[PDB]
Design an enzyme around this catalytic site. Structure first.
Site, PDB file in Angstrom:
ATOM      1  N   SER A 100       0.823  -1.209   0.000  1.00 28.18           N
ATOM      2  CA  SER A 100       0.000   0.000   0.000  1.00 28.18           C
ATOM      3  C   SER A 100       0.860   1.262   0.000  1.00 28.18           C
ATOM      4  O   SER A 100       1.466   1.606  -1.015  1.00 28.18           O
ATOM      5  CB  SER A 100      -0.954   0.003   1.197  1.00 28.18           C
ATOM      6  OG  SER A 100      -1.837   1.110   1.142  1.00 28.18           O
ATOM      7  N   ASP A 114      -8.774  -5.749  -5.114  1.00 24.05           N
ATOM      8  CA  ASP A 114      -8.563  -4.446  -4.491  1.00 24.05           C
ATOM      9  C   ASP A 114      -9.499  -3.416  -5.122  1.00 24.05           C
ATOM     10  O   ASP A 114      -9.634  -3.360  -6.344  1.00 24.05           O
ATOM     11  CB  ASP A 114      -7.104  -4.008  -4.624  1.00 24.05           C
ATOM     12  CG  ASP A 114      -6.717  -2.939  -3.615  1.00 24.05           C
ATOM     13  OD1 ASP A 114      -7.538  -2.034  -3.352  1.00 24.05           O
ATOM     14  OD2 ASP A 114      -5.592  -3.009  -3.078  1.00 24.05           O
ATOM     15  N   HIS A 169      -7.983  -5.414  -0.545  1.00 21.88           N
ATOM     16  CA  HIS A 169      -6.801  -4.679  -0.111  1.00 21.88           C
ATOM     17  C   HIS A 169      -6.337  -5.086   1.284  1.00 21.88           C
ATOM     18  O   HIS A 169      -5.139  -5.232   1.529  1.00 21.88           O
ATOM     19  CB  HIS A 169      -7.071  -3.174  -0.140  1.00 21.88           C
ATOM     20  CG  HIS A 169      -5.869  -2.339   0.171  1.00 21.88           C
ATOM     21  ND1 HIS A 169      -4.836  -2.159  -0.723  1.00 21.88           N
ATOM     22  CD2 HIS A 169      -5.530  -1.639   1.280  1.00 21.88           C
ATOM     23  CE1 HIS A 169      -3.916  -1.382  -0.182  1.00 21.88           C
ATOM     24  NE2 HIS A 169      -4.313  -1.053   1.034  1.00 21.88           N
TER      25      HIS A 169
END
Lengths: 347, 346
Positions: A138, A292, A321
């Site tokens: 991320s 995601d 995610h």
């Protein structure tokens, strides 16, 4: 004051890298990085691996999930260095810095500032001239790209999991709504609150918004939240999501959110993304998660085609995610197989 | 000032009388805003019912789907567009007096809308059967309710981008949409004297729709640029915020509450398969490929429980809000499907 301690985030050591001029004009008098080192360096210091932290996460989350002797990131082979983000509570943050940088007075820190701090750390304290691998997820992935672009010779291998080189407009909006989820709470008092708990209403709405975007529709449709030990959605929001964000500091979350919003490596070329990604000389594995919602596969695939000698190796998981939390054991197996092949590949 | 005939006309107000609601309360008088396009034939067998969706009116449906060259042809069918109870045109929190004014407006469910529409079609129009019931989103929820409540009355059914039973993920999405407004102090628990006063709440509502109403691929391919907006910021303000700005917070909350509890299995006690098994109409389940909350897998799960139905999804990267007629290709797909449906014998 009670959550960001060594009792639940240790072990890590505080290192003073000195004054740090930020991109937004302000200059931190002293910058402290919370660093977790696993494994020892060899003779020529060529087995160093850098691991950045993600949004609202610490170095403890990374080591419990990805770092291990039977894992790809093996401390018995490599010297894995986990550096906490500036503004995550452990390093220099709004919640632990005094003076005119206290609370809402904390400066706007960008991704480039984190990498700049980490580059100083690796050279002035460890004496490291090159990194065998830079791997993050991320926001940690955003720092991975910045590293590979800013210091192309320094980075031998790069692994970006569920993250992009340039933050999109759709992702920007998502974070903006995440911020307003907190700032709509009257208890926030423009960051002059006396307790992170006082801002529970903002943090609870913050948690629910992550529930909507952090996973996937298929995650809840197949009852994956039930397999984790929660009989319903309502109980999953409370027992898992709300539980996670509750003891955290609003100001720190806003600091990392602002930095997340402006993740962009093309600033070094003036907006030209293709010219910036072409600078990368490291062996890069672009690994997005299949389900995601904001860091989509098409976003990462679009950027991978600009990186020379890279490979598009997405991870399959319906957990979306927030599969980075290690909820999917099968997804971790995929990741280990990929990183092992990456570390085996010559540089 | 927004819910007038200058931008939603033409439509007629019809008093169907007292309406007992499922939530216990009883409306003394219920007024339905009805838009009729086309004439009935001799045996009155060419009637088509079109419910409205969330925050939408009868004007949106006729501007997008109704036309002479379209599947919903006024020269062949009598298309009847009924506005939702609580959408501003029909009986709503913003136009009803007495103990139903403002926040005092009762909790209206999907079944209450269909009950009102069934009373309208039989007691006032004298229609014994519907050639087709077609709607989108919330209009699809009423389509399913129709096919279950009155199985003999509905000959054909077309549910676009909607489910029979609302999921938990969709429920949560709507819950956050409501709180986007109620977090505004200007809301005053629904005691505001101007919908504009709650602009901050309405703006957050619009931005949240931007995140979920379309798709990531929609903005990635610059589809919003082809609509006339140079950037995301300019799209949010000039299109999304522009849309919700003149609307009433209370009305939006009424329809949101109804949306959250769309469930046909209440008629069987939670048994969805038993409820969907009641459908005798020819049904086309048509979800949008890139819908974020009314996903393709959700509708596919429900289609396999409906007798004599077909799974015919629509492909469009515009997502759920493709219902606004932003994708010309999606309309072509829908027309081809609806035409084949109306051509199929009964």
């Amino acid at each position: 004051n009670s959550y960001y301690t060594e009792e639940n985030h240790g072990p890590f050591e505080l290192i003073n890298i000195g004054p740090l001029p930020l991109e937004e004009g302000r200059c931190m008098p002293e910058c402290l990085l919370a660093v977790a080192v696993h494994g020892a360096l060899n003779a020529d210091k060529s087995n160093a691996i850098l691991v950045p932290t993600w949004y609202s996460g610490t170095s403890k989350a990374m080591e419990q999930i990805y770092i291990g002797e039977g894992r790809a990131l093996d401390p018995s082979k490599y010297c894995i260095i986990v550096v906490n983000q500036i503004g995550n509570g452990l390093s220099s943050s709004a919640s632990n810095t005094g003076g005119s940088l206290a609370g809402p007075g904390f400066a706007n820190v960008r991704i480039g500032d984190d990498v700049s701090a980490q580059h100083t750390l690796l050279t002035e304290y460890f004496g490291i001239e090159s990194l065998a691998l830079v791997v993050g997820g991320s926001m940690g992935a955003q720092q991975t790209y910045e590293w590979a672009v800013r210091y192309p010779d320094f980075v031998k291998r790069a692994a970006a999991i569920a993250g992009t080189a340039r933050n999109s407009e759709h992702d920007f909006l998502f974070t903006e709504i995440l911020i307003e989820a907190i700032t709509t709470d009257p208890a926030f008092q423009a960051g002059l609150y006396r307790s992170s708990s006082a801002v529970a209403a903002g943090l609870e709405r913050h948690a629910k918004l992550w529930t909507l975007m952090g996973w996937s529709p298929e995650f809840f449709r197949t009852g994956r939240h039930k397999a984790l030990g929660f009989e319903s959605m309502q109980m999953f929001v409370d027992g898992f999501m709300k539980r996670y964000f509750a003891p955290m500091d609003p100001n720190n979350l806003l600091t990392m959110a602002w930095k997340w919003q402006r993740g962009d490596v093309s600033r070094h070329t003036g907006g030209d993304l293709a010219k910036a990604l072409g600078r990368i000389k490291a062996k890069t594995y672009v690994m997005p998660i299949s389900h995601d919602q904001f860091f989509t596969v098409d976003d990462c695939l679009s950027e991978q085609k600009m990186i020379p000698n890279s490979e598009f190796r997405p991870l399959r998981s319906i957990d979306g995610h927030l599969g980075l939390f290690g909820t999917d054991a099968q997804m971790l197996d995929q990741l280990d197989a990929h990183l092992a092949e990456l570390l085996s590949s010559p540089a």
